Design an enzyme around this catalytic site. Structure first.
Site, PDB file in Angstrom:
ATOM      1  N   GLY A 163       0.762  -1.236   0.000  1.00 16.39           N
ATOM      2  CA  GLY A 163       0.000   0.000   0.000  1.00 16.39           C
ATOM      3  C   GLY A 163       0.798   1.294   0.000  1.00 16.39           C
ATOM      4  N   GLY A 196       4.410   7.717   2.812  1.00 10.16           N
ATOM      5  CA  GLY A 196       5.154   6.891   1.882  1.00 10.16           C
ATOM      6  C   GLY A 196       4.583   5.504   1.695  1.00 10.16           C
ATOM      7  CB  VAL A 197       5.768   2.670  -0.369  1.00 13.94           C
ATOM      8  CG1 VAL A 197       7.246   2.824  -0.053  1.00 13.94           C
ATOM      9  CG2 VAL A 197       5.403   1.212  -0.574  1.00 13.94           C
ATOM     10  CD  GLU A 226       0.150  -4.215  17.009  1.00 17.97           C
ATOM     11  OE1 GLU A 226      -0.388  -5.334  17.102  1.00 17.97           O
ATOM     12  OE2 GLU A 226       0.036  -3.358  17.899  1.00 17.97           O
ATOM     13  CG  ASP A 264      -5.225  11.974   7.973  1.00 15.93           C
ATOM     14  OD1 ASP A 264      -6.358  12.346   7.580  1.00 15.93           O
ATOM     15  OD2 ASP A 264      -4.378  11.479   7.205  1.00 15.93           O
ATOM     16  CE  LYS A 286      -5.895   8.103   5.848  1.00 12.53           C
ATOM     17  NZ  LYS A 286      -5.378   9.105   4.873  1.00 12.53           N
ATOM     18  CG  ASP A 341      -0.347   6.001  10.294  1.00 10.88           C
ATOM     19  OD1 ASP A 341       0.499   5.152  10.617  1.00 10.88           O
ATOM     20  OD2 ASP A 341      -0.745   6.136   9.125  1.00 10.88           O
TER      21      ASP A 341
END
EC number: 2.7.11.22
Length: 294
Positions: free
Chosen positions: A11, A16-17, A77, A123, A125, A141
């Site tokens: 993803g 970033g990735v 994790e 943020d 979601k 996050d």
């Protein structure tokens, strides 16, 4: 990276990735996020580092922070699925209320923990809500927003989702509070119930007007100080508030009541994660197991 065994992409995140990887030595399977540099800010390093101490059953554990060659990697994790995928998967029958209530209850505990430690998400979601086979759901996050900075236009110009943004953020308030996370979670709660995003705005103004159209254009009566917010315009159309029964049918009155307190315009009136856990809606809360197809 030679410390991991064949890492594979899974993803693209805000920064970033994101990869799934196995530590060659420990054998542990983890999530690896490469943060997208001018040598990487030392200020950000120490702040992100502090998050390593934030341990809670409902917070995705930050295992390590690796800084190398102007590069920052975050080791987390690993959990196999996110709520966005689960909701899409549950699209036909909808997530059963007991499971929606368990998830909301766990998310509020996670939020209460973070907020009591002066850490905000900013943020939230469905994509950063991870679940496992045990019926657990965890917030991913947390703290990265303040640690770094507000999104804008990533290297991949990934379209930043505005659907869960609190109104005080959209109206230009620079000082965010724990209330913005409660707003986002309220939006997510509504989405699990109706199976459709509550406020799917396609721009910042469209996001704001979708909120105004449903909850009514805010005024000085319901939100003291709103007309003096940085981005407020006396020209905003004045929409009347709709009935909540029309907002999240067929949620019962306990649920509608809690959502309403989570969606108060005034950040100061908005219910805290702590008070929300004591709402009557959670009186019969349980912990069902979801049926996940991994």
């Amino acid at each position: 990276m030679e410390n991991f065994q064949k890492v594979e992409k899974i993803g693209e995140g805000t920064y970033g990735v994101v990869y799934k990887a196995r530590n060659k030595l420990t054998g542990e399977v983890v999530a690896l996020k490469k943060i997208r540099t001018e040598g990487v800010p030392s200020t950000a390093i120490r702040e992100i580092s502090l998050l390593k101490e934030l341990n809670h059953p409902n917070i995705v554990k930050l295992l390590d922070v690796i800084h190398t060659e102007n590069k920052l990697y975050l080791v987390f994790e690993f959990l196999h699925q996110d709520l966005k995928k689960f909701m899409d998967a549950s699209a036909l029958t909808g997530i059963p209320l007991p499971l929606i209530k368990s998830y909301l209850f766990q998310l509020l505990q996670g939020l209460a923990f973070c907020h009591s430690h002066r850490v905000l998400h900013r943020d939230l979601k469905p994509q950063n809500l991870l679940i496992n086979t045990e019926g657990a759901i965890k917030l991913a996050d947390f703290g990265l927003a303040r640690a770094f900075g507000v999104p804008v236009r990533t290297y991949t110009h990934e379209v930043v989702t505005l659907w869960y943004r609190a109104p005080e953020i959209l109206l230009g308030c620079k000082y965010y509070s724990t209330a913005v996370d409660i707003w986002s979670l309220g939006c997510i709660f509504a989405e699990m119930v109706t199976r459709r995003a509550l406020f799917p705005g396609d721009s910042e103004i469209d996001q704001l007007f979708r909120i105004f159209r449903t909850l009514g254009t805010p005024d000085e009566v319901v939100w003291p100080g709103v007309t003096s917010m940085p981005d407020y315009k006396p020209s905003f159309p004045k929409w009347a508030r709709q009935d909540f029964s029309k907002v999240v049918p067929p949620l019962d009155e306990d649920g509608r009541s809690l959502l309403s307190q989570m969606l108060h315009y005034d950040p100061n009136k908005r219910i805290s994660a702590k008070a929300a856990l004591a709402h009557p809606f959670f009186q019969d809360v349980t912990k069902p197991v979801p049926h996940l197809r991994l």
